Amino acid sequence: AKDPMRVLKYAILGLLRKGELSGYDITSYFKEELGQFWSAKHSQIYPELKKLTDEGFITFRKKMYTLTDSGKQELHDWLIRHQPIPETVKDEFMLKAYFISSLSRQEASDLFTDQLLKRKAKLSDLQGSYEKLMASAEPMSFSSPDFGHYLVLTKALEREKNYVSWLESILAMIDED
Amino acid sequence: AKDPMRVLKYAILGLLRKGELSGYDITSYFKEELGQFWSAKHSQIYPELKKLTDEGFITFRKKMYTLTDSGKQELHDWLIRHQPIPETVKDEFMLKAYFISSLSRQEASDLFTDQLLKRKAKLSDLQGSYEKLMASAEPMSFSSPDFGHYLVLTKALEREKNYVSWLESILAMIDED
Ligand SMILES: COc1cc(/C=C/C(=O)O)ccc1O
Numbered sequence: 001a002k003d004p005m006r007v008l009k010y011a012i013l014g015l016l017r018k019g020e021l022s023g024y025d026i027t028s029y030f031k032e033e034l035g036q037f038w039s040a041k042h043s044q045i046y047p048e049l050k051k052l053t054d055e056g057f058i059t060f061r062k063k064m065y066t067l068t069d070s071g072k073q074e075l076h077d078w079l080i081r082h083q084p085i086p087e088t089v090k091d092e093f094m095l096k097a098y099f100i101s102s103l104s105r106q107e108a109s110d111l112f113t114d115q116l117l118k119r120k121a122k123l124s125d126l127q128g129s130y131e132k133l134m135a136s137a138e139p140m141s142f143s144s145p146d147f148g149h150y151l152v153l154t155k156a157l158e159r160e161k162n163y164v165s166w167l168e169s170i171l172a173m174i175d176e177d
Numbered sequence: 178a179k180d181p182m183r184v185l186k187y188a189i190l191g192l193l194r195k196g197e198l199s200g201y202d203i204t205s206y207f208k209e210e211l212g213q214f215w216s217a218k219h220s221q222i223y224p225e226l227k228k229l230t231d232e233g234f235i236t237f238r239k240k241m242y243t244l245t246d247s248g249k250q251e252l253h254d255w256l257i258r259h260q261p262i263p264e265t266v267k268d269e270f271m272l273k274a275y276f277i278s279s280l281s282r283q284e285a286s287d288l289f290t291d292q293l294l295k296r297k298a299k300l301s302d303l304q305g306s307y308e309k310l311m312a313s314a315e316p317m318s319f320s321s322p323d324f325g326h327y328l329v330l331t332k333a334l335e336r337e338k339n340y341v342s343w344l345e346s347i348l349a350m351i352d353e354d
């Protein structure tokens with residue numbers, strides 16, 4: 001069996017791509033933006049940092065961490081590797097939807113309406129984060145330092161907007177004329 | 178520590194909601210439609226079936242399995258329970274996108290174009306499954322026996338369409354005028 005903390009490997013190497021960071025800084029990215037789409041069990045971060053140092057991908061000199069040439073190559077190879085798209089992530093709400101025959105029209109309406117209100121609230125939160133990012137002076141483009149952050153935030157916004165739209169469509173079918 | 182096979186519990190109870198099924202039938206739903214969004218390690222199915230029988234949620238009389246009144250209540254309580262939306266599923270491609278600063282414009286174009294072609298192919302596959310479902314005679318509605326299947330398939334189609342659209346948008350930014 002392999003160590004579950006290995007899931008943090010490329011997240012850690014990537015965070016270091018632009019230059020040195022303290023463990024505090026790294027831990028901070030996980031507590032903030034990076035933890036929203038690549039959650040860490042915070043107990044795993046320092047141990048994985050140690051493993052990557054010991055494997056020669058990261059060095060340190062507070063301790064300040066940087067990529068080695070080996071680390072840079074390790075991150076580059078992973079970025080450019082093509083992998084099949086993975087298996088669909090288990091969405092428990094969608095398993096419920098699959099079994100909707102076990103609910104009355106009203107029960108189905110209440111289940112879907114609960115999910116819609118929750119997803120609209122999440123979308124409001126993402127929209128806030130997006131507006132915060134976009135409050136920067138430099139217009140957004142491929143060359144912006146913040147382009148990767150823009151990519152993750154716009155993906156999440158589109159994702160939740162699409163979930164909301166789908167739920168509204170189903171509610172209209174549950175509430176057919 | 179709890180048993181990972183417990184992830185199959187409500188999938189199994191739900192499959193039995195409309196009446197008796199053989200283990201072959203249950204295994205078949207997992208190999209086909211249900212495995213596409215709620216994947217089972219096929220080694221876990223029979224053991225979980227046994228656990229649910231022994232817990233009194235399912236009975237058997239080939240062995241043919243049915244929900245007990247307890248099982249029906251167990252499925253009902255889960256269906257109507259409201260849970261917070263869970264944490265975002267780790268999408269490794271999106272971690273790469275977050276670190277796009279480590280790629281040239283051409284490298285970024287090639288990465289995103291690979292992902293787009295793969296997602297368009299998956300979408301073609303979902304569209305085929307959708308057309309197969311919709312080849313039934315009875316028009317689709319809340320009251321259709323197939324409404325739950327429609328829900329999972331349309332969700333998946335919308336999901337992948339939205340991913341494709343997002344990728345196209347990013348490719349156009351990578352290829353700005
Ligand atoms: C709320 O702020 C953020 C959220 C995300 C991603 C969220 C998700 O994929 O669900 C990414 C960057 C952010 O700054």
Ligand SMILES: COc1cc(/C=C/C(=O)O)ccc1O
Binds near residue numbers: 303326
């Ligand atoms: C390809 O056929 C199917 C696919 C799905 C779901 C796929 C997913 O969520 O990725 C559901 C029912 C189907 O019949």
